[PDB]
Amino acid sequence: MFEQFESKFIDCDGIRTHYIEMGEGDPLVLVHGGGAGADGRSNFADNFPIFARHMRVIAYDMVGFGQTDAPDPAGFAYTQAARTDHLISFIKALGLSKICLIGNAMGGTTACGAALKAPELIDRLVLMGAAVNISPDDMVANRDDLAAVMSYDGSEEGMRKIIAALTHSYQPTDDIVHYRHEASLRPTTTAAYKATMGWAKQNGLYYSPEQLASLTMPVLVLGGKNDVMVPVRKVIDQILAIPQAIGHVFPNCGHWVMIEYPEEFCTQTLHFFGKL
Amino acid sequence: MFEQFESKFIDCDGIRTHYIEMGEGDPLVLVHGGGAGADGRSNFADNFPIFARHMRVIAYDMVGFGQTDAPDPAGFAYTQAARTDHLISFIKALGLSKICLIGNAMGGTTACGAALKAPELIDRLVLMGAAVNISPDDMVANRDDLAAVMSYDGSEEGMRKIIAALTHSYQPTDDIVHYRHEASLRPTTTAAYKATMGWAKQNGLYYSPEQLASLTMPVLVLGGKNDVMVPVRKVIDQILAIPQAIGHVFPNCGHWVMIEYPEEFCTQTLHFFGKL
Ligand SMILES: O=C(O)/C(O)=C(Cl)\C=C\C(=O)c1ccccc1
Ligand SMILES: O=C(O)/C(O)=C(Cl)\C=C\C(=O)c1ccccc1
Ligand code: NA
Ligand code: NA
Numbered sequence: 067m068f069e070q071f072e073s074k075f076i077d078c079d080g081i082r083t084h085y086i087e088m089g090e091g092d093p094l095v096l097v098h099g100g101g102a103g104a105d106g107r108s109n110f111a112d113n114f115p116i117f118a119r120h121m122r123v124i125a126y127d128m129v130g131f132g133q134t135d136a137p138d139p140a141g142f143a144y145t146q147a148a149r150t151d152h153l154i155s156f157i158k159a160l161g162l163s164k165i166c167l168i169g170n171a172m173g174g175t176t177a178c179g180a181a182l183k184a185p186e187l188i189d190r191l192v193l194m195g196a197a198v199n200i201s202p203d204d205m206v207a208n209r210d211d212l213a214a215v216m217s218y219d220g221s222e223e224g225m226r227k228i229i230a231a232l233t234h235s236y237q238p239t240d241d242i243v244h245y246r247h248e249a250s251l252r253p254t255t256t257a258a259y260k261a262t263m264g265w266a267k268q269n270g271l272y273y274s275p276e277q278l279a280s281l282t283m284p285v286l287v288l289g290g291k292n293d294v295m296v297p298v299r300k301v302i303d304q305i306l307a308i309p310q311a312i313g314h315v316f317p318n319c320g321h322w323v324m325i326e327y328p329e330e331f332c333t334q335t336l337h338f339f340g341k342l
Numbered sequence: 343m344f345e346q347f348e349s350k351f352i353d354c355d356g357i358r359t360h361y362i363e364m365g366e367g368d369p370l371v372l373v374h375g376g377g378a379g380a381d382g383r384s385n386f387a388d389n390f391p392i393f394a395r396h397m398r399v400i401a402y403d404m405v406g407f408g409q410t411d412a413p414d415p416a417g418f419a420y421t422q423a424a425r426t427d428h429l430i431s432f433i434k435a436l437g438l439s440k441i442c443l444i445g446n447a448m449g450g451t452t453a454c455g456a457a458l459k460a461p462e463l464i465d466r467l468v469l470m471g472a473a474v475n476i477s478p479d480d481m482v483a484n485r486d487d488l489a490a491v492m493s494y495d496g497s498e499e500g501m502r503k504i505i506a507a508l509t510h511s512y513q514p515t516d517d518i519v520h521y522r523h524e525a526s527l528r529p530t531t532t533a534a535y536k537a538t539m540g541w542a543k544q545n546g547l548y549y550s551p552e553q554l555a556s557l558t559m560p561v562l563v564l565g566g567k568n569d570v571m572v573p574v575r576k577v578i579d580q581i582l583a584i585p586q587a588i589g590h591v592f593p594n595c596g597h598w599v600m601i602e603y604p605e606e607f608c609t610q611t612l613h614f615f616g617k618l
Binding site for chain 2: 298302305306309310311312313314315316317333337
C-alpha cells in the first residue's frame with residue numbers, strides 16, 4: 067500500500083530515517099502519532115495531495131516506527147527527548163528551516179519539543195490532538211473508553227475496534243484495516259513500541275504550563291470534540307495555556323482529524339500557513 | 343457616519359425597524375450587540391463589503407437600539423423574548439428563509455433565541471461572544487475588569503476606555519469614538535437601554551444546557567481569548583454544550599472579533615456558510 071509515494075532515506079545522526087515528500091515550495095513537515103504500527107504514510111496519505119498543491123510536504127517515520135531505524139531497546143532509551151532530537155536532526159539533515167510543522171498526538175509532543183528546543187527551525191506549529199499535557203496520572207485513567215485500544219488482541223477484528231474507538235464515524239477500507247493490522251505486528255518495531263509506550267506511561271507526555279507559554283512562534287491547536295484519547299478538555303487547556311494559540315474544535319470527530327475531515331484539516335492549516 | 347449604506351425601514355408587527363443591506367444572493371443577517379448606542383452599521387461596517395461579495399448581507403437595529411422604534415418602556419417590556427420575536431418578525435417581513443445568521447453578545451442571545459423558536463427560518467448560526475449562558479449571578483461578578491464599562495461617565499474619554507476594555511489592541515478612529523459617544527446618549531434609546539440592561543442584569547441572558555443541545559442546524563461558535571465581557575470559558579462551555587458546534591477561538595482578541603479581525607472573521611464565517 068501507499069506505493070504512490072516514493073520512499074526516501076536520509077541519515078539523522080546515525081538513525082536511518084524513512085520519509086516521503088511531494089510538491090514544491092515552502093516546507094511542511096508532518097509528524098505521525100504513536101499508535102502501534104503508525105507511520106507517516108498511513109497517517110497522512112489523504113492529505114498529501116492536497117498539501118502538495120501549495121507546499122513541499124514531508125512525512126517521516128519517528129525513531130522506532132515505520133521504516134525508520136528502530137535501535138534495539140536493550141541499548142537505546144525510547145524517551146521523548148529521543149524523538150525530539152531525531153526530529154531536529156531530520157530537519158537539519160534535509161537542510162530546511164523556517165518550516166511549518168504539524169504533529170498528531172505523540173507526534174504533537176515531538177513537534178512541540180522541537181519548537182521549544184530549536185525555535186529557529188520552525189515558523190509555524192500545529193498541534194493536533196497533541197500529547198503536550200498528559201501526566202503520568204492522566205495515563206492510567208483507563209476509562210471504559212479505551213476497552214478496544216488497551217485490550218488489543220492482535221487480530222484484524224481487534225484493529226477494526228481500535229479504529230472505531232479512535233474515530234467518530236469513519237469506516238476504513240479493507241486495505242487500510244489490513245495495512246494497520248500488519249504494521250502493528252511488525253517484528254522490527256514491536257520492541258521499540260513496547261519501550262516507547264512503557265516510557266510514556268511512566269513519565270507521561272508533558273510540558274509545563276510555563277514551557278507551553280514560552281513557545282515563540284504562531285500556534286494552531288486542533289482537536290476532535292469526540293476524541294477519546296486526548297480528550298477535548300486537554301486540547302482546550304492547551305488553547306488556554308499557549309497565549310498566541312488559535313484554537314479550532316471539530317464536531318463529530320475523534321482523534322484522527324486529518325483522516326476523518328481531510329479537506330477541512332487541510333484548509334484550516336493551509337490558511338494558517340498563509341497559503342489560502 | 344456610515345452614509346455609504348442606505349437606511350431602509352420595514353414594519354415588524356408594529357415596530358418600525360431600521361436595516362441596511364448590500365450584495366446579492368443568499369441572505370445573511372447580522373445581529374449587533376447590546377452596548378450603549380450599538381447598532382448594525384457601527385457593529386458591522388468593516389465586514390459588510392467583504393460579505394457583500396458573496397451574499398446578500400443585512401444588518402438591522404434590535405428593538406430599542408439605533409433607528410429602530412424604541413417603544414416607551416412605561417408601556418413595553420424590554421425582555422429577551424421581545425428581541426427574539428422582533429428578529430423573527432424582521433426575517434419574515436423581508437420574506438427570507440433558510441438564512442445564515444450571526445449574533446454578537448446580546449445579539450447572540452437573540453439569534454439563538456430565533457434559531458430555537460423558528461428553526462425553519464435559519465440554516466446556519468454563528469454565535470460570537472454570544473450571551474447564551476450568562477446567569478443572573480454571572481451578571482454581578484463586576485470584576486475589576488469592568489471598571490471602564492460599568493462606571494462610564496458619559497464622556498468621550500470614558501468611551502475611549504470602554505473601547506479599550508472591550509478590545510485587545512484596537513485603536514478606534516476619532517470619528518468612531520465620536521459616533522459611539524453620541525449614540526450612547528441618544529435620548530430616543532437611552533430609556534429603552536436602561537430597561538434592556540435592567541432586565542438582563544436581573545434575569546440573565548441564558549438558555550438551558552438542554553435548550554442549547556436542542557439547536558437543529560449547524561452552529562459555529564467564536565470567541566476572543568481576551569474577551570473581558572463574555573469570558574473565553576463561557577464560549578468554551580457553549581462549544582461543549584452544543585454537540586454539532588464548531589469552535590474557533592481567536593488569540594490577541596477582545597470582545598469585538600468582527601472589528602478587531604474583520605478579515606479572519608469574514609473568512610471563517612463565509613467558509614462555514616459554504617461560500618469559500
Ligand atoms: O494517531 C495515532 O497515531 C494513533 O492512532 C494513536 Cl493510538 C496515537 C496515540 C498516541 O500518540 C498516544 C500515545 C500515548 C498516549 C496518548 C496518545
Ligand atoms: O458588542 C457590543 O455591542 C458591545 O460593545 C457590548 Cl458592551 C455588548 C454587550 C452585550 O451584548 C452584553 C450585555 C449584557 C451582558 C453581557 C453582554
Ligand atoms: Na467511535
Ligand atoms: Na484592552
